[PDB]
From a paper:
To confirm whether the unusual structural conversion of Tk-PTP is indeed associated with the presence of a flexible GG motif within its P-loop, we prepared a recombinant Tk-PTP protein containing the Gly95Ala mutation, referred to as Tk-PTP(G95A). The GG motif within the Tk-PTP P-loop was abolished by this mutation; therefore, it was expected that Tk-PTP(G95A) would have a canonically arranged P-loop, similar to that of Tk-PTP(form II). Tk-PTP(G95A) was expressed and purified as was Tk-PTP(form I), and then subjected to crystallization trials without being heated. The structure of Tk-PTP(G95A) was determined up to a resolution of 2.3 Å using cubic-shaped crystals with the space group H3. Intriguingly, the resulting crystal structure of Tk-PTP(G95A) was nearly identical to that of Tk-PTP(form II), especially in terms of the conformation of both P-loop and α4−α5 loop. The P-loop of Tk-PTP(G95A) matched very well with that of Tk-PTP(form II) with RMSDs of 0.16 Å over eight Cα atoms and 0.25 Å over the entire 55 atoms. Accordingly, the ϕ and ψ dihedral angles of the 4th (Ala95) and 5th (Gly96) residues of the Tk-PTP(G95A) P-loop are similar to those of Tk-PTP(form II), but quite different from those of Tk-PTP(form I). Taken together, the α4−α5 loop of Tk-PTP(G95A) is structurally similar to the corresponding loop of Tk-PTP(form II). Collectively, this structural analysis indicates that Tk-PTP(G95A) adopts an enzymatically active structure even without heat treatment, and that the presence of the unusual GG motif in the P-loop enables the described structural flexibility of wild-type Tk-PTP, the characterizing feature of this protein differentiating it from other PTP proteins. The catalytic activities of Tk-PTP(G95A), which constitutively adopts a catalytically active form, was also measured by the same method.
Numbering used by the authors: 1 to 156
Amino acid sequence: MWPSAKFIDGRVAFSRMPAERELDEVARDFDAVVVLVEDYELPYSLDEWEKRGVEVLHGPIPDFTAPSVEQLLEILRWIEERVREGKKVLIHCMAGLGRSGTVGVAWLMYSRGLSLREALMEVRRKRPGAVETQEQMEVLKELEERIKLAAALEHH
Ligand SMILES: [Cl-]
């Protein structure tokens, strides 16, 4: 297991950007990768993943910014489809902090129904620093309220 990978359940991890020399290892350990960096941040083409038999969702998010709630939910749905096929999924930004941490917190709230508080404490335990900006934090409250609101519809 790639030591940079920070697992938030048995199948999904977040990390920093693998370097090109790290790709063979990351590919032996993961079947799918959600790449959250922008093109100019990458030091190799995303074909390198394809060549190694790894499925890619490229969901670029400019650094120190936040996805919208709809980008987040799109990423979550794709992660869920792969987990269902028996895959392991790595989510990665550049530093392993704000962007990939924001998605990882979103993954715990969606898949396990934990509060933003409990999810954020789990992600920070694995990587202190994660979720960097207040826009990142805001989108997570936005998502939390939507999750509560959707769970409330199902009760009544
Ligand atoms: Cl919704």
